[PDB]
Design a protein around this nucleic acid. Sequence first.
RNA 1: ACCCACUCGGCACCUUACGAGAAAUCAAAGUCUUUGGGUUCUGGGGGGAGUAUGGUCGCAAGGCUGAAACUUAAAGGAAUUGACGGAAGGGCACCACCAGGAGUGGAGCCUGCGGCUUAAUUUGACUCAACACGGGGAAACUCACCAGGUCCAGACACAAUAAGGAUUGACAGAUUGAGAGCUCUUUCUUGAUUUUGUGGGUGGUGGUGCAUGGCCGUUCUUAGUUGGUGGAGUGAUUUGUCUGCUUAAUUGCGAUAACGAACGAGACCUUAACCUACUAAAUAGUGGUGCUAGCAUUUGCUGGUUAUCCACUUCUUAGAGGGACUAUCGGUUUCAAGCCGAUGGAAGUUUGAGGCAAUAACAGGUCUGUGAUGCCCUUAGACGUUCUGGGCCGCACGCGCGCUACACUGACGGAGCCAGCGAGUCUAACCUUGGCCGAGAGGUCUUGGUAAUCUUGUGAAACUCCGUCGUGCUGGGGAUAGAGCAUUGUAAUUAUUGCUCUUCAACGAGGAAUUCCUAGUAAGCGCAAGUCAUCAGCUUGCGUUGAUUACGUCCCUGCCCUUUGUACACAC
Lengths: 73, 55
Amino acid sequence: RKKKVYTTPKKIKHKHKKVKLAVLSYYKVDAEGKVTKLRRECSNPTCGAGVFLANHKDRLYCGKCHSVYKVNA
Amino acid sequence: ATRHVLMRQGVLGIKVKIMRDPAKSRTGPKALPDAVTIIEPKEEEPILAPSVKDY
RNA sequence: ACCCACUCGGCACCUUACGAGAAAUCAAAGUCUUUGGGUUCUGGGGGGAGUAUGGUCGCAAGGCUGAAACUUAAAGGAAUUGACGGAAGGGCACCACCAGGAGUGGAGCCUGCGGCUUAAUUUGACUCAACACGGGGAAACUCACCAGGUCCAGACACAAUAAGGAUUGACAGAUUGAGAGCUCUUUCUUGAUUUUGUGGGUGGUGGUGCAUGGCCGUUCUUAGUUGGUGGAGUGAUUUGUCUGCUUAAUUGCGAUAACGAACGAGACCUUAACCUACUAAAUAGUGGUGCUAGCAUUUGCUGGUUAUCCACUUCUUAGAGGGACUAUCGGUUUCAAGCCGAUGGAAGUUUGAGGCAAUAACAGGUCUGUGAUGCCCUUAGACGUUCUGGGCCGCACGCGCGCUACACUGACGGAGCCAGCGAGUCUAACCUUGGCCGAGAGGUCUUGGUAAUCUUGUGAAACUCCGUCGUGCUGGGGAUAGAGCAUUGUAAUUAUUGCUCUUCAACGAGGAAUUCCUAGUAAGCGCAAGUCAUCAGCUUGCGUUGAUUACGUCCCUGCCCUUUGUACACAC
């Protein structure tokens, strides 16, 4: 009970948790106008039509549908 | 009955054996197998002559 | 010369304790803490050491006289209880022998050890009392080992961060064995459930079995063990608890400073034997037949049928019992306990076999059974847990338990007919009849059975009847290998297992040594249950066929009791 080498590199590299940035959900700034939309939500009715869904590149990933959501765009 | 008690230094085993009274058995044998009890006979008055009991 | 009674003086002896003594013992070792009859010599813990030195005697060997330095906590006496003895006397044991049987040790293989090897080949146990044992027949898990990867399941309470956000989880890319966001440029997401430091927990098949409980093995299958009150001794302690005889037995008969008891033995409790005696029973078996089969109708023999009848428990089952207590005779014995014969009896080696089983112990095994545990260690890239792979199976070699054999008291093929123990499917599929397919192993359909009703008369095997083989490692043996089929499993490759064909090795009865066993016992034979998804060459039982040789002994190995000796007591 004194043998430990750990030939692999130090693997304590726990994942990031969306480090504290500015206020999220950047809808728009409209002078006495309807707040227009950016990174618009997808077409699935399961979303509350106000949740800023992810869109990396020609694909959409849904946080609420954490396991099953894949569309070709 | 065996029991384990936990002290600061370890565990102590307690073993309690009770031999109860067979004359209290209320079930199964009422005495030990080797216990033989003799019934005392009742002495009777002699005769000294043949008599006939009258109806 | 003897025999009596004295007497004086000797060598002694027996008994007892007035006494004495540490006791052994002592008529002196008494008349000595109630200390004094006279007198000589000697000793002052153990060694060094009867040495050195001086003296003196002697031819010499040596004798007499005779230290110290230094060293040391005990040496020593007498007894007690044990243990031990190549001590004695009794009594015993096939874990001893005797006379034998079957064997093991020799071969191949299967398993467990050691060593070697390795990333790991996890580990405990090493004479009896470790090595087919941890119910340990490990493919994954088991698993504790090794190569790696996750996850926290770090409770609960103190400060920081902290809804202008504690911090959760992610498809797809890179990375990875890997559809593990494990992690990482990339964005989304639930929200106080957590994250970070702190105290403190938790888990641990991590250590200690020499810190423990319990349990188990062993001492030790033998018969032994202990109070009370009396007796003995200053005492430890002893007597009781024993000279003798008997029993398997501190079993009894008895003897007797012991009497009266307790545990162990026995008794006891299960199991196997007997019941034509009671209760019985379409979940077991019995008889004329209702019905229907064959040779056969003389007036029989051999079968099938639950709802077609009645009666029975001989046999089967179980409950209540009875039976055997050595019963009755003969012989023997302080003419007792008992033992030995013979006749009955199912049973006459406490009827056979078990279960249970003193005191006191062992630093025996086990912390890897336990959420049974004290202390120590680790505790978040943890020794937790889980996932994927391996290892526990590796092979120069040594050892133990075993399986198969070396053969015609046989091998092979065909034919016959036989048991007993036991198990079986519920939030999941067990034992599986029968029909059909297949050479075989196996595959398909449902009624059968949660069970004396169905597997299952478990139609087992050894075994008997005919054949083939013919003393040739041969048709003995079937190790080692090649090809294929199937089954179990998510997964079989360093072959799970079975089957078909082929391959056809040592082994020609085994050295020193050594094991078990006295009647349905050994041995042979197979069957069922255990662990079992699959795997028995292993165990726990069961039944089938069923020898030799003993009815003893203490020679070897031990055991119990007594006596004895001991410089032993961590006890030869």
